UniProtKB/Swiss-Prot annotation:
This is Green fluorescent protein. Changing N196S: In EBFP1.2; shifts the excitation and emission spectra to shorter wavelengths and increases quantum yields compared to BFP. Belongs to the GFP family. Changing N196I: In mut2.1; shifts fluorescence lifetime from 3.03 to 2.50 ns. Changing S173G: In GFPA; leads to enhanced fluorescence at 37 degrees Celsius. In Venus; leads to yellow fluorescence, improved maturation and reduced environmental sensitivity. The lineage of its organism: Eukaryota, Metazoa, Cnidaria, Hydrozoa, Hydroidolina.
Amino acid sequence: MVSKGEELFTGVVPILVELDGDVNGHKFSVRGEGEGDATNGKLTLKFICTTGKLPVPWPTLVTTLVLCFSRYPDHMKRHDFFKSAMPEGYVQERTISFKDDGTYKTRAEVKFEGDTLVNRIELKGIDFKEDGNILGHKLEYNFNSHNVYITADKQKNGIKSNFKIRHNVEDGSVQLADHYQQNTPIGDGPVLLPDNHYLSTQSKLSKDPNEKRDHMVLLEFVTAAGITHG
């Protein structure tokens, strides 16, 4: 263990995710539950739209809806900001710019509440096109594999990332979603600020055959990489 936080992730940890959103005035909420295991990088989550029909495509919410569950290899343990901020946790903020379309702005807190790792999010979506790929639900129900580059932000005692997500569109085109991210500790205890590296992601989206509500099942693996050794 190279942070106290890391001790909270030696096994499987239950997860709760709660999102309250407003996209072009369309208000919706999501709740998810499941579990994560940073020892193998595996996340299993099922989300429900609790307000009815989700007014945006599920794949557009994957990144918003717990990088503390990334598998950091043994030689990279000292570069794991996310666990080091636990249990008090961190604020994760993004701007997600959909190319030629609207923008999501998100603020989340990721922290332990009791024994559960909780990701609680506020999302505001603006300037979407009524007949665009998002509000028009033109995006395929799938998700690509990405590298998400992590850099220290010494001024804010946290990290930052920017990355592009490529959403497949039903007409064979691609909808780009350019992510800019910042994470900052909730607490004022010490955290690990990393050397430059990246997280390798892969996600599989599916449906629960017994679930009649609008929902998404997610199976994800996230592994850290990119440090020559230490």
